[PDB]
Design a protein around this ligand. Structure first.
Ligand SMILES: Nc1ncnc2c1ncn2[C@@H]1O[C@H](COP(=O)(O)OP(=O)(O)O)[C@@H](O)[C@H]1O
Lengths: 232, 238, 240, 242, 48, 240, 239, 87
């Protein structure tokens, strides 16, 4: 089994590619992130905690928009997340140029899944050590997707990956209901961040973005502080 | 520990040897015995068929082929390797008959074929070519402006003018016998008789019409492969 | 468990990229140290200088450089990787100026060069340039910025950062200074950097052993603090 | 010993060091010794060349090349490596002249050649240039500079440095020489005695000394020491080496 | 040495003191040794 | 196996050697000996022809590339032949573009540049052929020996190949006449050199020797059994 | 060692990957072809479809051109690929020279294709042996065997796949000049050779006959029962 | 540090190992030394006592320079490869 956990183009005699599983293990060790799809919108959040407050939290953002209504969060490697954001922006804008219409999020997830599974096609190039959470609103429907280092993509009413993802998933399945409202969705997301935050979230310790009929927008620090106070 | 240098042709032994090329050389001994002899009246090429089954079509198994009407060939090694070599040789001879509109000398024939050979470790294989040394030893004979000429080609690309060379499984023994059986004034008929004598002494079975392919090239006629009746005539004496 | 530390493109169990950490440790191999401190409208970079002999030309052994006329740079690690990375950074900044018609912001320069290093560490055709970077500059509506880049392609802004053999202790000292919440004026920023270096090294260095660069709002040009002004600054620190 | 890490140049060490460039360091230190000194109005070069066999002609394996008209080329390491590095440096200088229309500064040429030699250090399908070379020039409007660039890729500025089996030895006896003031006339003597004392006679005997310099004494043009000054330097050596 | 001692006597060289006949099995080592024993006019010793 | 450092040219030994290059260097020690001498105005290449069997011709060791420049090979047939076609193409290109013969020093420099690429870059095997280069240019005859380590030397003489140390020490005994000798004298010196290489039981027969001579007015002409006959008639007898 | 490398000679001068690909044919299925005076026949053992396989798409015998046919033994995907390539090449040859492709040309093309697929790494050899049959312009019966090594050979009646040695010996012992006097005699020989290894008879055998440019029709499963009735009749006739 | 044997090192080494030999003064140890390039140490045993045994091969002659040059040429490489495909 060890001789097959070294390349991405050799099948293990029993199962499948082991490098993909190791990339997934890299993903599961990343920063926790939770996305929740409410009835009228979607919310995705993550923890930005890092030692050495010397670090400029505003310098980098874990939640970025792809277009006016598509946003994404990750869990795992940072630079790979940035590269995925770049490729996703290029693909979405190519779709916009070809069709002159805002890119449906399902097609965006499919294309980003294809581009990341492209890195899994041959040896010499490691698969992305990053899993994506895609939030989007279109045709009067909020969409939430997860993109995998393996190139697999699936939908999610509400999920959470990264560190302590099993406990967060249990919390979500013990909290989420199909008739959830946007503000209550944000409350549930911040609570999910909390139950394994380990160190008293501040306004800048976490980062949360929201998408709805009015497009996608990452919440400003003031609204984050207000929501944190409301939850307390 | 040789094992680290046999893997691949681009490795050098501590004794500076090309082990892949040496293995290709030894792979010639897997082929059937081929004997060519050079005489003033011409060159004759004798080979063993090694027929696997009586149902075989003897025309299919080719140990001697024609590159041009003035030149002849003999093979020992892989069938497909020699097929590419012979096709390239024929293409080259027509290339010369195009460029200079003349019959191109056998030494230049082996020159061009050896140019196709020894190209295994060459970066020009990017379109596609041998990543491995060619695995057939070639016996070239014919008549040119220097009279009858016979050249033996080494899968490494080396060639040498040989009065009488033997390649194949019994190259060592046949060469040893040719060493004392060869004379410079040997006539074509007695040379071919001696060649079949060596084959009889060397070949694993009896000599019949289906055990030997025979070829001759003389300044007078063009390349002639001995027919069934000619083979019977030349073998009934022996 | 182990044995996966041979190729940059191989994921170990638990999804740990050994060779990248190997490069991060290679950053330290230079044997030097460097720190960057930022004020309200200034950003001071100071680095140590070790000279085996007088036989070398001290004017060419500078460890801090200038990416563009207002963007300065300091870095450590392998010096060959250092000069290759500064060449690439200057190339990228010039290309940005050519294509977009205005000077590269520090954050975007760090982002692009970190993307380059990420592509280096993503494919197995490249040794991932084992030298860390610190970039400084001034930007309108945001003020001075100090950014750090590493061979992994991880980039982040810093109120204060450090690198070299004494990374952890320098960062701890930086945290100890920044938790006091003081304005850090330009001379104060420079003196904090010098004190950090001297204490983490415990050498109380002569002024000839440090190179300093500073960028301010009134002097957007990346000024390499000359011997006269570094002498003034650090001997004033001595008496102050 | 690092086994399993030094089969390629793109693999780091657990201590974080590429062992290929360190092995190139080792090869350079197992090579011949070459000294250079920059005078007040130019730079001079000196090569200790071992005549492995008297069958070799004099001037064989010439080691003090000249990359440009105003730029010399001293180098220690592998002669094939030396020639390849010299050729790429010459092409670089020619390209600089073709594109920019004036002489290449020594510092800029050193930066370009260091970048190129680094480009062979960090790949896996190639190997770092295991040879250390010298760059020397004299410009009337720029000055005089000297640079040593080893296979590690670091191009640092040295007033006058040495590379070879007597690196530290030549450092010890070139430190005692005062340098910055006298010109080539009073520096060639020191170079000659230094080269003739660093060489070991009991082991690795049979060496000859060749010299070259650039400066206004030949109008900023690099050339070998003239035969008259060459024999004068040899005479000062034999007098001073006693 | 056995049949011509005088040449190593007047060459002042000690005759060979020991020899190792190392080779793969079945090569003939035993048989060559026995043959040389017969032709050296000395009795062969077999020590299994 | 501690010799995992000799499987490709692109890895160094821990002691700083490329063992593959050294094996390529030793490879040409296998081929037959070949010694060259040069006069005031004439350079000779004399080689010991070898045959696979006495019933076949001897392997040519003196190759003509251009009227003024000639080469002698000792080592792999393939590499030497490829180098010969490369030499012929370059000499023709020089004659076509400059209308002047390729300088011996320049030819050997381009030979070194061509053969260094296999030594430096993964892929092509190092050119394991020892080449003896003898030509004529403005400053007279030259003898260049290109060792398969991609190195070359300007030599008064050189013997490369099997048991070439005997010829080397012969020439080491006999410098004092090489410079002032005429055609016949230098030819007989070279023949004595090969005879020193050749053991007792063998002698320099007509089929055994190959002689190539170049000079100021005499082109690089190679002699054979009938052509070497006048030159060996002046040859003395072996001092046995 | 020396086995896991397509283009590395063994110390005893063997390209072991090529021989392993050749041996991979012996794990296929028996396919015997005989050429007669005016006919060529192809006898192949048919895998008995369990309950659901559509026999229309389990094609073991396929015709490259209207003048050539072929049966294969080896991996079916490789056979399909080589079939597509070889019939494309037959059509392109007719484009270049306008005359029907001779059996020698198409067999040479197939051998050269297999060879160029077994001379470089990253390209696995075509592990299939194909029996090429057909008539030339002058209607001469020719049959060729192609070997995964990239070589071809002219066979009067050859068998490939599992049990090919037994069929080979059977043909050696039974191939006569008078055994090909009539089409029915050639058929009797080929069904006899088939039932040598596939003794069940009836089904599990497919036959194809090419006469002098009839654009061969595979013998349909109505006269295979008739032809095997004839075979059994002659079989109880001599015994 | 044990370096490569020097020419004098050789000369004296075959002198001491051959001190038991009846070597005539017609030899020249120094020229052997200068042809002992890369011949080191235990390679006495080869050149040295194998030269005694070559004098036996030569026909039990005096230990003259002929067998010493012969041993130098042979040493470990006494086997002749006689290899084809080399020009
Ligand atoms: N050179 C040889 N000449 C004759 N017979 C030999 C030779 N080599 C091996 N044999 C045969 O091999 C057989 C066994 O050899 P043996 O001496 O037992 O091998 P080993 O050297 O391993 O002891 C003997 O019967 C002998 O006939």
């Amino acid at each position: 089994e060890r001789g097959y956990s070294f390349s991405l183009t050799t099948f293990s005699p029993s199962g499948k590619l082991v490098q993909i599983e190791y990339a997934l293990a890299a993903v599961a060790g990343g920063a926790p992130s939770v996305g929740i799809k409410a009835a009228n919108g979607v919310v995705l959040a993550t923890e930005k905690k890092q030692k050495s407050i010397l670090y400029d939290e505003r310098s980098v953002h874990k939640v970025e928009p792809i277009t006016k209504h598509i946003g994404l969060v990750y869990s795992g490697m940072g630079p790979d997340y940035r590269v995925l954001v770049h490729r996703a922006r290029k693909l979405a804008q190519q779709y916009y140029l070809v069709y002159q219409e805002p890119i449906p999020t399902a097609q965006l997830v499919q294309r980003v899944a294809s581009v990341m599974q492209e890195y899994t096609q041959s040896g010499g190039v490691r698969p992305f050590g990053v899993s994506l959470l895609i939030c989007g609103w279109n045709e009067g429907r909020p969409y939430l997707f997860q993109s995998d280092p393996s190139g697999a993509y699936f939908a999610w009413k509400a999920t959470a990956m990264g560190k302590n993802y099993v406990n967060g998933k249990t919390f979500l399945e013990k909290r989420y209901n199909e008739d959830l409202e946007l503000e209550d969705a944000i409350h549930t997301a911040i609570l999910t961040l909390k139950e394994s935050f380990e160190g008293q979230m501040t306004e800048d310790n976490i980062e949360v973005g929201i998408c709805n009929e009015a497009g996608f927008r990452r919440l400003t620090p003031t609204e984050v502080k207000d929501y944190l106070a409301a939850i307390a | 520990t040789r094992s680290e240098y046999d893997r691949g042709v681009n490795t050098f032994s501590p004794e500076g040897r090309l082990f892949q090329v040496e293995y290709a050389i030894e792979a010639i001994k897997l082929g059937s015995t081929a004997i060519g002899i050079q005489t003033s009246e011409g060159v004759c090429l004798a080979v063993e068929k090694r027929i696997t089954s009586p149902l075989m079509e003897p025309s299919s198994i080719e140990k001697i082929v024609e590159i041009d009407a003035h030149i002849g060939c003999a093979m020992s090694g892989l069938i497909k390797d020699a097929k590419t070599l012979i096709d390239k040789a024929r293409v080259e001879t027509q290339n010369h008959w195009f460029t200079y509109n003349e019959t191109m000398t056998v030494e230049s024939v082996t020159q061009a074929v050896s140019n196709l050979a020894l190209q295994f470790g060459e970066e020009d294989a990017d379109p596609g070519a041998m990543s491995r040394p060619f695995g057939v030893a070639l016996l070239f004979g014919g008549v040119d402006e220097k009279g009858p000429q016979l050249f033996h080609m080494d899968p490494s690309g080396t060639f040498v003018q040989c009065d009488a060379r033997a390649i194949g499984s019994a190259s060592e023994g046949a060469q040893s016998s040719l060493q004392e059986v060869y004379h410079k004034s040997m006539t074509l008929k007695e040379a071919i008789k001696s060649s079949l004598i060596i084959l009889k002494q060397v070949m694993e079975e009896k000599l019949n019409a289906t055990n030997i392919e025979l070829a001759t090239v003389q300044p007078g006629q063009n390349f002639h492969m001995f027919t069934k009746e000619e083979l019977e005539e030349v073998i009934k004496d022996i | 468990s182990a044995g996966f530390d041979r190729h940059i493109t191989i994921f170990s169990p638990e999804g740990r990229l050994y060779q990248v950490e190997y490069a991060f440790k290679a950053i330290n191999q230079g044997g030097l140290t460097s720190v960057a401190v930022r004020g309200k409208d200034c950003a001071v970079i100071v680095t140590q200088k070790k000279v085996p002999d007088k036989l070398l030309d001290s004017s060419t052994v500078t460890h801090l450089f200038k990416i563009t006329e207002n963007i300065g740079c300091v870095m450590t690690g392998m010096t060959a990787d250092s000069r290759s990375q500064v060449q690439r950074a200057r190339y990228e900044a010039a290309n940005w100026k050519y294509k977009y018609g205005y000077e590269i912001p520090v954050d975007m320069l760090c982002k692009r060069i970190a993307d380059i290093s990420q592509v280096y560490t993503q494919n197995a055709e490249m040794r991932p340039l084992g030298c860390c970077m610190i970039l400084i500059g001034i930007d309108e509506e945001q003020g001075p910025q100090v950014y750090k880049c590493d061979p992994a392609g991880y980039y982040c802004g810093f109120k204060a950062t450090a690198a070299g053999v004494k990374q952890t202790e320098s960062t701890s000292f930086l945290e100890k200074k920044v938790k006091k919440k003081f304005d850090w004026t330009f001379e104060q920023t420079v003196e904090t950097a010098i004190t950090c270096l001297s204490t983490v090294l415990s050498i109380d260095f002569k002024p000839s052993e440090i190179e300093v660069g500073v960028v301010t709002v009134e002097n957007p040009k990346f000024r390499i603090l000359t011997e006269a002004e570094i002498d003034a600054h650090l001997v004033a620190l001595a008496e102050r | 010993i690092g086994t399993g890490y030094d089969l390629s140049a793109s693999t780091f060490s657990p201590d974080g060091r590429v062992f290929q460039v360190e092995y190139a360091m080792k090869a350079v230190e197992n090579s011949s010794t070459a000294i250079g000194i920059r005078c007040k109005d130019g730079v001079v070069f000196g090569v200790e060349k071992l005549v492995l066999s008297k069958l070799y002609e004099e001037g064989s394996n010439k080691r003090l090349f000249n990359v440009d008209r105003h730029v010399g080329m001293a180098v220690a390491g592998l002669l094939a490596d030396a020639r390849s590095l010299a050729d790429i440096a010459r092409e670089e200088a020619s390209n600089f002249r073709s594109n920019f229309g004036y002489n290449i500064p020594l510092k800029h040429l050193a930066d370009r050649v260091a970048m190129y030699v680094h480009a062979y250090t960090l790949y896996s399908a190639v190997r770092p240039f295991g040879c250390s070379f010298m760059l020397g020039s004299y410009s009337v409007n720029d000055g005089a500079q000297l640079y040593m660039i080893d296979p590690s890729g670091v191009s640092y500025g040295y007033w006058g440095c040495a590379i070879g089996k007597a690196r530290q030895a030549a450092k010890t006896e070139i430190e005692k020489l005062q340098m910055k003031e006298m010109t080539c006339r009073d520096i060639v003597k020191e170079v000659a005695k230094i080269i003739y004392i660093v060489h070991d006679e009991v082991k690795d005997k049979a060496f000859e000394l060749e010299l070259s310099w650039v400066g206004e004494l030949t109008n900023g043009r690099h050339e070998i020491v003239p035969k008259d000054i060459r024999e004068e330097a040899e005479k000062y050596a034999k007098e001073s080496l006693k | 040495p056995l049949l011509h001692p005088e040449r190593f006597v007047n060459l002042g060289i000690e005759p060979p003191k020991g020899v190792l006949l190392f080779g793969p099995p079945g090569t003939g080592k035993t048989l060559c040794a026995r043959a040389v024993a017969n032709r050296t006019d000395a009795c062969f010793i077999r020590v299994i | 196996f501690r010799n995992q450092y000799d499987n490709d040219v692109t890895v160094w030994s821990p002691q700083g050697r490329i063992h593959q290059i050294e094996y390529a260097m030793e490879a040409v020690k296998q081929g037959s000996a070949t010694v060259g001498l040069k006069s005031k105005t004439h350079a000779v290449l004399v080689a010991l022809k070898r045959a696979q069997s006495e019933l076949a011709a001897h392997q040519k060791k003196i190759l003509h590339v251009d009227n003024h420049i000639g080469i002698s090979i000792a080592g792999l047939t393939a590499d030497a032949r490829l180098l010969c076609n490369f030499m012929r193409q370059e000499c023709l290109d020089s004659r076509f573009v400059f209308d002047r013969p390729l300088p011996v020093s320049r030819l050997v420099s381009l030979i070194g540049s061509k053969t260094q690429i296999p030594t430096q870059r993964y892929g092509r095997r190092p050119y394991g052929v020892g080449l003896l280069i003898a030509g004529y240019d403005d400053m007279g005859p030259h003898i260049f020996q290109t060792c398969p380590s991609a190195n070359y030397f300007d030599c008064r003489a050189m013997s490369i190949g099997a048991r070439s140390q005997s010829a080397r020490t012969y020439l080491e005994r006999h410098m004092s006449e090489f410079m002032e000798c005429n055609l016949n004298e230098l030819v007989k010196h070279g023949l004595r050199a090969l005879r020193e290489t050749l053991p007792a039981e063998q002698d320099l027969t007509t089929k055994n020797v190959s002689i190539g001579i170049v000079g100021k007015d005499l082109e690089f002409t190679i002699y054979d059994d009938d052509d070497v006959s006048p030159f060996l008639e002046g040859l003395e007898e072996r001092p046995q | 060692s020396y086995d896991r490398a397509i283009t590395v000679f063994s110390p005893d001068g063997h390209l072991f990957q090529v021989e392993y690909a050749q041996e991979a044919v012996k794990k296929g299925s028996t396919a015997v072809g005989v050429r007669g005076r005016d006919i060529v026949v192809l006898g192949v053992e048919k895998k008995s479809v369990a309950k659901l396989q559509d026999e229309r798409t389990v094609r073991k015998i396929c015709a490259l051109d209207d003048n050539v046919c072929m049966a294969f033994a080896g991996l079916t995907a490789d056979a399909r690929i080589v079939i597509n390539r070889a019939r494309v090449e037959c059509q392109s040859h007719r484009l270049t020279v306008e005359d029907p492709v001779t059996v020698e040309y198409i067999t040479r093309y197939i051998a050269s294709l297999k060879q160029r697929y077994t001379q470089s790494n990253g390209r696995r050899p075509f592990g299939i042996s194909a029996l090429i049959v057909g008539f030339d312009f002058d209607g001469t019966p020719r049959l060729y065997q192609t070997d995964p090594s990239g070589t071809y050979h002219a066979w009067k009646a050859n068998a490939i796949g599992r049990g090919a040695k037994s069929v080979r010996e059977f043909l050696e012992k039974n191939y006569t000049d008078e055994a090909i006097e009539t089409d029915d005699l050639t058929i009797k020989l080929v069904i006899k050779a088939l039932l040598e290894v596939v003794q069940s008879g009836g089904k599990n055998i497919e036959l194809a006959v090419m006469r002098r440019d009839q654009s061969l029709k595979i013998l349909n499963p109505e006269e295979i029962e008739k032809y095997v009735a004839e075979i059994e009749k002659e079989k109880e006739e001599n015994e | 540090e044990f370096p490569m044997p020097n020419e004098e090192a050789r000369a004296r080494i075959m002198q001491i190992h051959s001190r038991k030999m009846n070597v005539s003064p017609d030899v020249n140890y120094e020229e052997l030394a200068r042809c002992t390039d890369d011949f080191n140490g235990a390679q006495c045993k080869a050149v040295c006592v194998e030269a005694g045994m070559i004098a036996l091969r030569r026909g039990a002659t005096e230990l003259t320079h002929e067998d010493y040059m012969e041993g130098i040429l042979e040493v470990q490489a006494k086997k002749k490869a006689n290899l084809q495909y080399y020009a």
